[PDB]
C-alpha cells in the first residue's frame, strides 16, 4: 500500500464474536460441503465455519458448529465426515471450433461434495476471444469473471480467484480453442455428505481426531447406539493410554423417562455424558444428541473455574418435564436434563453418567466439573515431560526441583481460587521400596465449595 | 570442585576514562535499589517492589599523580575487566557517568606509602562481557 | 588488504548453525553430485553440505545430511556413493576457423555426475577476440565470464574461478582458434548417482569409511535387507577388531507391526538399532530408514551425558501408532518407535536391538545410552596406547602410573556427573598368574540414575 | 551520458568507501512506461530519479532540475527525517496517475511528486533500488535507510584519526574500541533514531583472525514511523 | 610495575601560614560534594548532580609549641608538598581559608609523648604543581 489515511466504513452487521472463550472441542461434522480427510481448527469467529462448511441449516456441520460456537468454545476442531462412496462433483468443458467437440477443461469440486453447484459459460461481449465464466450455488452466484479464451488463462483464473473455493479447474490438454456455451450444468460424481453416514467412516474420523487433544468429544450429535458404543470404546482406549477425552452424547426422542434413565445407568463411565431432553432455539428443534453439542461446548468453555449445573443456556424451550421426586430419580440414574426455569432454559445439575458410585470411591467424582478438574490436573502434571523425563537426575536435588515445579503449578492454580489448600511432597512409603529410576510423589487438594443448595426459613 | 573457576585479584585491569590505572589496591561497585515496601489490608506479609536504582563505587589505590585532583567532579567512566587465566573467559563491566563524591587532595602518614581512596556514584552499567 | 574500517552489512538470512553440537557420524550418501572416492568431513555448517552435495531435496545426500545436521552432530563424515558405471559428464568444444572443426577443449564435470549441467559459449561484444562462457544448472546460471579466445586463457579461467566447481577444462591441443558457438549443451557420459545403488558399491564405501572412527554408522537410510546384513557383518568385524561402531537402521513401510517386531528380534546385536516408524517433517515424508539418520545423529550428538528416550524430535508427525500394551510388546521385541506425544514428535524409549537379554548378562546393556557409554570407556581407555604400550616398564612404578592415569580419566569423567562412584585397581587374582609382559587391571562404576518413570498418587 | 558518467563516479567512490547519494531526473519527453523502465534500469542503492516536473513561482522546473531541490531536502532532513510526504514548496506538478498506477510506478522505483493539497507533497521516500531480491531485505530500498546506513558507515569510519595505527590489539584496546563505538551508538540513540542496539566482538570471525585484524559486529532497530493509517467508521 | 612512581610519607613538607611544620605525623584533606539526588517520573534511576563544595582537613602531630592555641580560630593557609626522589616530579597543594573547628588546648597521657591533633574546614584549593 501507499502512505496515507484510508477511511473505510464497515457495516455494523459484521460484528466479531465475543472474547470470553476458552477450551478446545472436537466435532466430526457431517458436512455436505467442506474439508474431507483433515481436521480444521476454527477460531471463535463464525465466519470461517460458514465459509468452509456451508450456510445451510439442514447441514449438520453448520447447525452443530453454530451450537458449539454459541457454546463459546475458544477453538472448535472440525473434521468433515463423508461416506466412502461420496466423491467430488465433476464436469468437463469442451470446445466447438472443430466439428467434433473435445475435452479441454475439467471442473471438479475443490473438496468432495454433490451440492447444487452449477456452472455457466458464455461469450464475452467486450472481447471476442474472452469468455464469461460464472458459478452458481442453489441459484446464487458465487464467481463471475471474463478471461481470455486460452485454456491456460481460464484455468489460472479459476484456480486463482478466491470465489472459486468450490471448484478446481485443470487443463485436460493444451489448447486455445473457443469453449462450448453451457448453461446451468450441475457438478456430478459424488454424494450429499450427510447421507450414508456409517460406522467405519466415524472410525476413520476418530483416528483423524487422534491428531490433537480435546477437552471434550461430542460425536457431532448422532444418537446411533453403535456409534455411541464405538466412541465409548475409543475414549476408554484413550484414557487407558493417558489421553483424557470427555465424551458427550444424547438419547433419542423415542425414549421414555424410564428408558432414558436405564440408558444413563447403563453408562457407568467417569468421562461419558448423555443429554436426555431435546430443546428448541430460534424456533428450530434440536434433538438431545444435537443439544449435547452445545452442552459439551459450554462445559469446555467453562472448563475450570466454572460449572454448568444451572447455567443460563441460550435455548428457549425444552422437553420432556418431570416433578422434583422424578427429577431426583432421574439424576440418581445419572441423566442430564434441561429445564425451563424462567424465560430462558437452565440446566438442572452438573452430573455425568458415573452418578452410580460405590463405597470404595467417593461421591465427588460423579460430577462433570470434578472430572474436568481431575483431567486437567492429570494432563497439566503430565505436560511436565518435555524438559523433565530423561533430562533430570534422580537425586535429592532433582527430586526437590520436581516438587518445586509441581508446587509451582499448584500455587498458580490456587491463584485463580480453584483450590483452598494443597500439599505436594515425596511419597516416602512407596519411595523406600522404589527402584533407582522410579520417582514417587503424592498430592492433596481441597476444591473450593460452590453454593448449590440454599434454604430460607421465613417468619412473620 | 573446579579450581579453575576461581578468579584472583591479580587478573584485574582498570581503565579510568580510557587510560589504564595500574596502582590500584581494591575496587567496589554496587547498583542499589530504593526498595519500596508495601503493606496490604488483606495480606499479612510485606510486598517489596523495585525502586529507583543508584550506583555507588569506591576505589582505593596508591598515589602516583594528581589525576583525581585534576579530574575534579567531572563525569568519567570506569571499565573493569576481570579475566580468567586457566580458562580464557573474562568479564568486562563499564560504569557510566561516574562522579567523585569527594576529592582526595591530601592523605599521608608519617612512614607509610601515600595512598589514595575515592568514592562516588554512577548512573548505570553495561555488562560488556562475561 | 589496506588499513581501515570496512563496514559491510550482511543479510540476516545467513545465520550460522548452533553451537551445542558433539560427536562424529558416518554417511554413505547417494549423491547425484559430489566428491567420489573420498570421505569429506563437513562441520556444523550446512553450507559446505549444499555447496558440495547439491541443494535438491530428492538427492539422498542433501536430504539425509540435512537430517543429520538438524540432529546436531558436530562433524558429519560424508562419502559419495555412485555405481561403477556412473561417470563424469563430458563434452568437447571445437573451433570454426577452419572448414573442418577440431577439438581444442574438453569440459568434464569436476566429479562424476550426470545432472543437467549445461554449457553455452558465444562471442564477446566488448572484444572480438574474447568469448563469453556460461554454465547452467537446471536452467540456473552458475558461472559467467568473458575471456580471450586463446584456449590457454579459457582453460585457465575455467579451472581457476570458483564458480566452475562443477567442471574442469583441459586443453586438448595448443590453439588460439575461435571456438564454436554452442547453446545449452548438456554434459553427458555418466549416470545419475542415486541410481544403480549396489551392494559392492556400499562395500567399497564401507572400506573407505574404515579410514576414520565413528560414534555411529547410519547406512544413509537405505532399507535393503542385503545392505543391512553386509553393514551388520562389517560392524561386527570392526567390533571384533576393537573399533566400536553403533549401527542405525530402519524398517520398510510395507512391514506390519508383527513383522517389524520379528525383524527387531532377529537383530540381537548390542550395537545395532532399527527404527520401525516413518515420520513427516516440513510436510515431507521420511521412511523409517531415512528417519534413522536423524535418530543416529541425535544419539551421537547427545553421546554421553544424554539420551534420546523421550527427546524432543523435530518431526511433526509419525506413523504407525500403538496402545500401551502393544508398545510394551514392541519394546520387548526391541523396536524403536517414535510417538506424537504433543505437537512435536517424541521418542518412546532409548532401546537397541539387544533388548532380548539372557540371565548370564544384565539388563542395563540393552539401551543405546549404555552401549555408547561402554563403547566410549573402551575407546578412551584404549586411546591410552600412544605413549603407554611399548614405552612403559612392567614394574610397580609403571603399573602405579597406569592406575593413576586410568583413575585420572575416571575422575575427570566423574566430574561431568556421568558416574556416582568408581574403582580402579590391579586385578590381583589374574595378575598372580600373569606372564611377565602381561598387565591385568579391573574397574567398577555406577552410572548416575536418570528419572524415567514417575507415579503420582492423587487425593481430594 | 552524464547520468551514466556520474553513476560510475559514485559507484567508484562507494567502492573506495566515499558514500555519495546521487539524485537525477527524467526528461519531459518520457511517458509513464518509459520513466518506469528508466527507473528499473537503475538498480543502485545510492541513485535517485525524479520522474515529474514542477512549477514554482509560475516558473517551470524539469524533473532533473526539481531533483536539485529533492536532494537538498533529503540532505537537510538527513537523519531524524524523511521526504516521503514532505511539504514541498512547489505549487503544481505533472504528470498524474491513479493509485494502482502510482503503485506500479513506485514498484518500478520512481519518485513522483503529487499535488495533494494547495502545496505539492511527495508520494513516498523511495530510491531506484526498490527492485530487491530475497538475499537482501526490503528496508534498504528507501532513501532514508540509505542515508542512515551511509551515515553510520561514515561515522564509524571517521574513527581512524586517533584509532588506527595508534591503538594496541589486546583486550584493553579492543574494549576501548567497543566503548567508543557504543558511545557513538548511545549518543545516536539519544536523538531517538534507534530503539535498541548492540555492539560486541565478532567472536566467530575473531577466532580465525590474524594478529593485526580486529573484527566486530553491531545490531540496531530503527524506530518505526507512521506511514499508513486506516480508520474504520461506523454510524 | 614502576617502583619509582610510589611516594612515601617521608617526602612530605608542610607549611602552616608560610612557616614549615616539622613535627607532624599525618595530614588529611578532602573536598566534598553536597551531591544532589534527582528522581524523575519517566526514568528508573537516580540522577546525581554536583552541589556546593566544602573542604575538610585533619592534621595530627607532636606538640612542640602553643602555635595552634595562639592561632585560635583565625583563617590560615596550608601548603602541602609531596615530592618524588627517584623522579624529580612533585605535587603542591594550597588549602585556602583554613580554619580550626576546635583548639587542642590540652592533650597528654601518663607516659606517652604529647601529641596534638586538629581538624577544620577550608574553602577551596589551588593545585600549584603536580
Tab-separated table of C-alpha atoms in Angstrom, chain A residues 120-449:
chain	number	residue	atom	x	y	z
A	120	UNK	CA	-22.391	-21.357	-16.850
A	121	UNK	CA	-20.044	-20.278	-19.649
A	122	UNK	CA	-20.765	-17.842	-22.480
A	123	UNK	CA	-19.002	-15.482	-24.872
A	124	UNK	CA	-17.618	-12.146	-23.687
A	125	UNK	CA	-19.202	-9.110	-25.327
A	126	UNK	CA	-16.273	-6.751	-24.694
A	127	UNK	CA	-13.683	-9.039	-26.338
A	128	UNK	CA	-14.423	-11.835	-28.800
A	129	UNK	CA	-11.565	-14.014	-27.537
A	130	UNK	CA	-12.694	-13.642	-23.914
A	131	UNK	CA	-15.417	-15.736	-22.287
A	132	UNK	CA	-17.573	-15.127	-19.219
A	133	UNK	CA	-17.403	-17.918	-16.620
A	134	UNK	CA	-19.991	-17.938	-13.836
A	135	UNK	CA	-20.647	-20.320	-10.930
A	136	UNK	CA	-23.979	-20.776	-9.111
A	137	UNK	CA	-24.822	-22.187	-5.667
A	138	UNK	CA	-28.507	-23.106	-5.187
A	139	UNK	CA	-29.344	-20.444	-7.791
A	140	UNK	CA	-26.966	-17.973	-6.069
A	141	UNK	CA	-23.952	-16.585	-7.912
A	142	UNK	CA	-20.523	-17.363	-6.434
A	143	UNK	CA	-17.914	-16.347	-9.037
A	144	UNK	CA	-18.039	-14.219	-12.180
A	145	UNK	CA	-15.195	-13.085	-14.431
A	146	UNK	CA	-14.226	-12.559	-18.069
A	147	UNK	CA	-10.974	-14.240	-19.146
A	148	UNK	CA	-9.260	-14.836	-22.492
A	149	UNK	CA	-10.355	-17.923	-24.410
A	150	UNK	CA	-6.971	-19.584	-23.864
A	151	UNK	CA	-7.393	-22.622	-21.623
A	152	UNK	CA	-4.261	-21.703	-19.654
A	153	UNK	CA	-5.603	-18.306	-18.569
A	154	UNK	CA	-9.044	-19.783	-17.855
A	155	UNK	CA	-7.601	-22.472	-15.582
A	156	UNK	CA	-5.271	-19.931	-13.955
A	157	UNK	CA	-8.065	-17.508	-13.069
A	158	UNK	CA	-10.389	-20.312	-11.944
A	159	UNK	CA	-7.762	-21.765	-9.600
A	160	UNK	CA	-6.572	-18.284	-8.511
A	161	UNK	CA	-9.684	-16.262	-7.634
A	162	UNK	CA	-10.882	-16.908	-4.088
A	163	UNK	CA	-14.554	-17.025	-5.128
A	164	UNK	CA	-13.680	-20.331	-6.867
A	165	UNK	CA	-13.278	-22.018	-3.460
A	166	UNK	CA	-15.869	-24.631	-4.530
A	167	UNK	CA	-14.087	-25.727	-7.737
A	168	UNK	CA	-10.688	-26.512	-9.258
A	169	UNK	CA	-10.039	-26.221	-12.997
A	170	UNK	CA	-7.359	-28.466	-14.516
A	171	UNK	CA	-6.261	-28.287	-18.154
A	172	UNK	CA	-7.084	-31.591	-19.859
A	173	UNK	CA	-4.893	-30.810	-22.863
A	174	UNK	CA	-3.102	-27.829	-24.339
A	175	UNK	CA	-5.491	-25.796	-26.482
A	176	UNK	CA	-6.650	-22.253	-27.237
A	177	UNK	CA	-9.976	-23.278	-28.797
A	178	UNK	CA	-13.202	-21.442	-28.008
A	179	UNK	CA	-15.171	-23.303	-25.352
A	180	UNK	CA	-18.735	-24.549	-25.678
A	181	UNK	CA	-21.587	-22.451	-24.292
A	182	UNK	CA	-23.271	-24.404	-21.476
A	183	UNK	CA	-25.931	-23.040	-19.113
A	184	UNK	CA	-26.510	-24.248	-15.544
A	185	UNK	CA	-24.591	-27.539	-15.647
A	186	UNK	CA	-24.502	-29.210	-12.227
A	187	UNK	CA	-21.295	-30.808	-10.998
A	188	UNK	CA	-21.924	-34.536	-10.504
A	189	UNK	CA	-19.954	-37.616	-9.496
A	190	UNK	CA	-20.456	-37.710	-5.747
A	191	UNK	CA	-22.885	-37.907	-2.840
A	192	UNK	CA	-24.539	-35.484	-0.437
A	193	UNK	CA	-22.248	-35.859	2.589
A	194	UNK	CA	-24.921	-36.055	5.276
A	195	UNK	CA	-26.178	-39.291	3.639
A	196	UNK	CA	-24.752	-42.795	4.154
A	197	UNK	CA	-23.113	-41.776	7.426
A	198	UNK	CA	-21.523	-45.068	8.503
A	199	UNK	CA	-19.657	-46.551	11.458
A	200	UNK	CA	-16.407	-47.139	9.558
A	201	UNK	CA	-16.437	-43.512	8.411
A	202	UNK	CA	-16.668	-42.303	12.016
A	203	UNK	CA	-13.929	-44.720	12.990
A	204	UNK	CA	-11.691	-43.168	10.335
A	205	UNK	CA	-12.644	-39.714	11.615
A	206	UNK	CA	-11.863	-40.702	15.209
A	207	UNK	CA	-8.447	-41.880	14.055
A	208	UNK	CA	-8.079	-38.495	12.343
A	209	UNK	CA	-9.183	-36.851	15.591
A	210	UNK	CA	-6.324	-38.638	17.392
A	211	UNK	CA	-4.074	-35.937	15.870
A	212	UNK	CA	-4.844	-33.490	18.690
A	213	UNK	CA	-6.045	-33.345	22.304
A	214	UNK	CA	-9.567	-32.267	23.268
A	215	UNK	CA	-11.274	-31.059	26.409
A	216	UNK	CA	-14.342	-32.986	25.217
A	217	UNK	CA	-15.718	-35.003	22.295
A	218	UNK	CA	-19.291	-34.590	21.083
A	219	UNK	CA	-19.914	-37.220	18.306
A	220	UNK	CA	-21.498	-34.445	16.151
A	221	UNK	CA	-24.928	-35.094	17.666
A	222	UNK	CA	-25.722	-38.545	16.234
A	223	UNK	CA	-27.725	-40.777	18.578
A	224	UNK	CA	-26.936	-44.134	16.940
A	225	UNK	CA	-26.256	-46.747	19.614
A	226	UNK	CA	-23.456	-48.427	17.647
A	227	UNK	CA	-21.725	-45.078	17.163
A	228	UNK	CA	-22.054	-44.274	20.864
A	229	UNK	CA	-20.532	-47.651	21.733
A	230	UNK	CA	-17.656	-47.216	19.271
A	231	UNK	CA	-16.819	-43.735	20.558
A	232	UNK	CA	-17.133	-45.041	24.131
A	233	UNK	CA	-14.543	-47.738	23.445
A	234	UNK	CA	-12.404	-45.120	21.686
A	235	UNK	CA	-12.366	-42.745	24.659
A	236	UNK	CA	-11.799	-45.654	27.050
A	237	UNK	CA	-8.768	-46.705	24.994
A	238	UNK	CA	-7.517	-43.111	25.013
A	239	UNK	CA	-7.920	-42.836	28.795
A	240	UNK	CA	-6.045	-46.115	29.239
A	241	UNK	CA	-3.344	-44.639	27.001
A	242	UNK	CA	-3.487	-41.447	29.106
A	243	UNK	CA	-5.312	-39.095	26.725
A	244	UNK	CA	-8.345	-37.802	28.631
A	245	UNK	CA	-11.401	-37.139	26.445
A	246	UNK	CA	-14.788	-36.200	27.920
A	247	UNK	CA	-17.490	-37.746	25.733
A	248	UNK	CA	-20.913	-36.106	25.377
A	249	UNK	CA	-23.961	-37.868	23.944
A	250	UNK	CA	-27.749	-37.732	23.931
A	251	UNK	CA	-30.746	-40.009	23.846
A	252	UNK	CA	-33.284	-40.235	21.061
A	253	UNK	CA	-36.781	-38.745	21.061
A	254	UNK	CA	-38.493	-42.152	21.236
A	255	UNK	CA	-37.101	-42.980	24.684
A	256	UNK	CA	-39.499	-42.519	27.585
A	257	UNK	CA	-38.410	-41.395	31.053
A	258	UNK	CA	-37.722	-44.920	32.308
A	259	UNK	CA	-35.869	-45.847	29.113
A	260	UNK	CA	-33.565	-42.818	29.257
A	261	UNK	CA	-32.942	-43.436	32.968
A	262	UNK	CA	-31.966	-47.035	32.185
A	263	UNK	CA	-29.766	-45.840	29.313
A	264	UNK	CA	-27.918	-43.496	31.665
A	265	UNK	CA	-27.470	-46.208	34.288
A	266	UNK	CA	-26.093	-48.424	31.509
A	267	UNK	CA	-23.268	-45.911	31.106
A	268	UNK	CA	-21.067	-46.134	34.216
A	269	UNK	CA	-18.047	-44.238	32.881
A	270	UNK	CA	-16.487	-41.184	34.507
A	271	UNK	CA	-15.939	-39.355	31.195
A	272	UNK	CA	-19.223	-40.048	29.370
A	273	UNK	CA	-22.217	-37.685	29.445
A	274	UNK	CA	-25.728	-38.053	27.997
A	275	UNK	CA	-28.481	-35.476	27.455
A	276	UNK	CA	-31.994	-36.877	27.864
A	277	UNK	CA	-34.023	-33.853	26.745
A	278	UNK	CA	-34.489	-32.130	23.393
A	279	UNK	CA	-34.570	-28.345	23.028
A	280	UNK	CA	-35.835	-25.587	20.736
A	281	UNK	CA	-33.926	-22.400	19.902
A	282	UNK	CA	-34.837	-19.747	17.316
A	283	UNK	CA	-37.958	-21.916	16.812
A	284	UNK	CA	-35.727	-24.725	15.407
A	285	UNK	CA	-35.680	-28.085	17.157
A	286	UNK	CA	-32.554	-29.821	18.447
A	287	UNK	CA	-32.684	-33.461	19.498
A	288	UNK	CA	-30.954	-34.310	22.809
A	289	UNK	CA	-27.899	-35.581	20.943
A	290	UNK	CA	-27.693	-32.352	18.926
A	291	UNK	CA	-28.201	-30.336	22.128
A	292	UNK	CA	-25.318	-32.339	23.614
A	293	UNK	CA	-23.050	-30.426	21.210
A	294	UNK	CA	-23.899	-27.128	22.909
A	295	UNK	CA	-23.773	-28.772	26.338
A	296	UNK	CA	-20.259	-30.073	25.669
A	297	UNK	CA	-19.245	-26.713	24.226
A	298	UNK	CA	-20.406	-24.846	27.330
A	299	UNK	CA	-18.738	-27.430	29.582
A	300	UNK	CA	-15.446	-26.929	27.745
A	301	UNK	CA	-15.869	-23.137	27.716
A	302	UNK	CA	-16.323	-23.108	31.482
A	303	UNK	CA	-13.541	-25.685	31.763
A	304	UNK	CA	-12.155	-24.947	35.211
A	305	UNK	CA	-13.397	-22.128	37.474
A	306	UNK	CA	-16.889	-22.892	36.194
A	307	UNK	CA	-19.713	-25.387	36.001
A	308	UNK	CA	-22.930	-25.906	34.051
A	309	UNK	CA	-25.171	-27.036	36.909
A	310	UNK	CA	-27.636	-24.159	36.395
A	311	UNK	CA	-26.021	-22.181	33.589
A	312	UNK	CA	-28.209	-19.842	31.533
A	313	UNK	CA	-28.461	-21.795	28.294
A	314	UNK	CA	-29.499	-19.973	25.127
A	315	UNK	CA	-32.343	-22.428	24.466
A	316	UNK	CA	-35.859	-21.030	24.882
A	317	UNK	CA	-37.831	-24.280	25.342
A	318	UNK	CA	-37.171	-27.912	26.332
A	319	UNK	CA	-38.951	-31.251	26.695
A	320	UNK	CA	-39.907	-33.540	28.467
A	321	UNK	CA	-40.559	-32.321	32.056
A	322	UNK	CA	-40.662	-34.003	35.448
A	323	UNK	CA	-41.581	-33.471	39.097
A	324	UNK	CA	-38.986	-32.900	41.820
A	325	UNK	CA	-39.134	-36.506	43.020
A	326	UNK	CA	-38.954	-37.686	39.412
A	327	UNK	CA	-36.052	-35.312	38.707
A	328	UNK	CA	-34.359	-36.781	41.786
A	329	UNK	CA	-34.867	-40.309	40.453
A	330	UNK	CA	-33.579	-39.293	37.022
A	331	UNK	CA	-30.492	-37.584	38.459
A	332	UNK	CA	-29.767	-40.618	40.644
A	333	UNK	CA	-29.953	-42.672	37.450
A	334	UNK	CA	-27.444	-40.166	36.045
A	335	UNK	CA	-29.297	-38.223	33.336
A	336	UNK	CA	-28.580	-34.628	32.430
A	337	UNK	CA	-31.926	-32.857	31.977
A	338	UNK	CA	-32.531	-29.294	30.846
A	339	UNK	CA	-35.352	-27.336	32.481
A	340	UNK	CA	-37.244	-24.186	31.503
A	341	UNK	CA	-36.902	-22.492	34.879
A	342	UNK	CA	-37.600	-18.980	33.546
A	343	UNK	CA	-37.991	-17.427	30.088
A	344	UNK	CA	-34.613	-18.991	29.216
A	345	UNK	CA	-33.616	-22.621	29.707
A	346	UNK	CA	-31.458	-23.649	32.685
A	347	UNK	CA	-29.612	-26.914	33.377
A	348	UNK	CA	-30.740	-28.930	36.399
A	349	UNK	CA	-27.345	-30.119	37.696
A	350	UNK	CA	-23.790	-30.803	36.510
A	351	UNK	CA	-23.924	-34.602	36.533
A	352	UNK	CA	-22.202	-37.316	34.489
A	353	UNK	CA	-23.101	-40.943	33.799
A	354	UNK	CA	-20.964	-42.018	36.802
A	355	UNK	CA	-23.509	-40.937	39.419
A	356	UNK	CA	-23.836	-44.619	40.310
A	357	UNK	CA	-20.876	-44.741	42.714
A	358	UNK	CA	-19.718	-47.400	45.183
A	359	UNK	CA	-18.274	-47.334	48.685
A	360	UNK	CA	-14.632	-47.786	47.642
A	361	UNK	CA	-14.852	-44.490	45.687
A	362	UNK	CA	-16.096	-41.061	46.735
A	363	UNK	CA	-19.204	-39.174	45.651
A	364	UNK	CA	-17.467	-36.009	44.432
A	365	UNK	CA	-16.192	-37.628	41.219
A	366	UNK	CA	-19.700	-38.184	39.797
A	367	UNK	CA	-19.884	-34.587	38.514
A	368	UNK	CA	-18.647	-33.172	35.206
A	369	UNK	CA	-16.781	-30.334	36.925
A	370	UNK	CA	-14.725	-32.739	39.033
A	371	UNK	CA	-13.976	-34.945	36.012
A	372	UNK	CA	-12.738	-31.931	34.054
A	373	UNK	CA	-10.755	-30.743	37.087
A	374	UNK	CA	-9.052	-34.103	37.700
A	375	UNK	CA	-8.418	-34.496	33.964
A	376	UNK	CA	-6.884	-31.022	33.791
A	377	UNK	CA	-4.592	-31.803	36.734
A	378	UNK	CA	-3.535	-35.154	35.294
A	379	UNK	CA	-2.787	-33.529	31.942
A	380	UNK	CA	-1.008	-30.470	33.377
A	381	UNK	CA	1.235	-32.586	35.586
A	382	UNK	CA	1.564	-34.941	32.610
A	383	UNK	CA	2.627	-31.992	30.431
A	384	UNK	CA	5.786	-31.773	32.577
A	385	UNK	CA	7.771	-34.268	30.456
A	386	UNK	CA	9.116	-32.108	27.641
A	387	UNK	CA	12.082	-30.959	29.796
A	388	UNK	CA	11.737	-33.291	32.728
A	389	UNK	CA	11.844	-37.037	31.912
A	390	UNK	CA	15.140	-38.371	30.624
A	391	UNK	CA	16.612	-34.896	31.182
A	392	UNK	CA	16.792	-34.753	35.033
A	393	UNK	CA	18.769	-36.732	37.603
A	394	UNK	CA	17.209	-38.952	40.296
A	395	UNK	CA	18.984	-37.473	43.333
A	396	UNK	CA	17.704	-35.218	46.107
A	397	UNK	CA	18.408	-32.104	44.023
A	398	UNK	CA	16.409	-33.378	41.064
A	399	UNK	CA	13.526	-34.607	43.213
A	400	UNK	CA	13.389	-31.271	45.017
A	401	UNK	CA	13.282	-29.436	41.681
A	402	UNK	CA	10.436	-31.770	40.682
A	403	UNK	CA	8.472	-30.981	43.826
A	404	UNK	CA	9.207	-27.277	43.366
A	405	UNK	CA	7.799	-27.327	39.824
A	406	UNK	CA	4.689	-29.267	40.836
A	407	UNK	CA	4.158	-26.961	43.814
A	408	UNK	CA	4.549	-24.009	41.453
A	409	UNK	CA	1.801	-25.379	39.221
A	410	UNK	CA	-0.485	-25.951	42.209
A	411	UNK	CA	0.241	-22.476	43.616
A	412	UNK	CA	-0.561	-20.814	40.303
A	413	UNK	CA	-3.680	-22.990	40.208
A	414	UNK	CA	-4.555	-21.810	43.719
A	415	UNK	CA	-4.128	-18.233	42.474
A	416	UNK	CA	-7.375	-18.492	40.482
A	417	UNK	CA	-9.201	-19.586	43.651
A	418	UNK	CA	-9.829	-23.092	42.305
A	419	UNK	CA	-8.328	-24.655	45.460
A	420	UNK	CA	-8.451	-23.691	49.135
A	421	UNK	CA	-5.418	-25.709	50.267
A	422	UNK	CA	-2.971	-28.179	48.761
A	423	UNK	CA	0.013	-30.361	49.600
A	424	UNK	CA	2.746	-31.813	47.380
A	425	UNK	CA	5.518	-33.963	48.883
A	426	UNK	CA	7.517	-37.148	48.324
A	427	UNK	CA	5.663	-40.460	48.692
A	428	UNK	CA	8.061	-41.850	51.279
A	429	UNK	CA	6.199	-45.126	51.894
A	430	UNK	CA	6.484	-46.223	48.281
A	431	UNK	CA	9.754	-44.373	47.607
A	432	UNK	CA	11.537	-46.524	50.188
A	433	UNK	CA	10.777	-49.600	48.052
A	434	UNK	CA	11.359	-47.725	44.780
A	435	UNK	CA	13.721	-48.835	42.065
A	436	UNK	CA	16.583	-46.466	41.241
A	437	UNK	CA	14.858	-44.997	38.176
A	438	UNK	CA	11.402	-44.667	39.732
A	439	UNK	CA	10.340	-41.451	41.465
A	440	UNK	CA	7.175	-41.483	43.576
A	441	UNK	CA	5.195	-38.473	44.802
A	442	UNK	CA	1.772	-37.671	46.233
A	443	UNK	CA	-0.511	-34.645	46.347
A	444	UNK	CA	-3.601	-33.442	48.193
A	445	UNK	CA	-6.077	-30.707	47.354
A	446	UNK	CA	-9.352	-29.247	48.588
A	447	UNK	CA	-11.612	-27.741	45.940
A	448	UNK	CA	-13.353	-24.533	46.955
A	449	UNK	CA	-17.008	-25.026	47.802
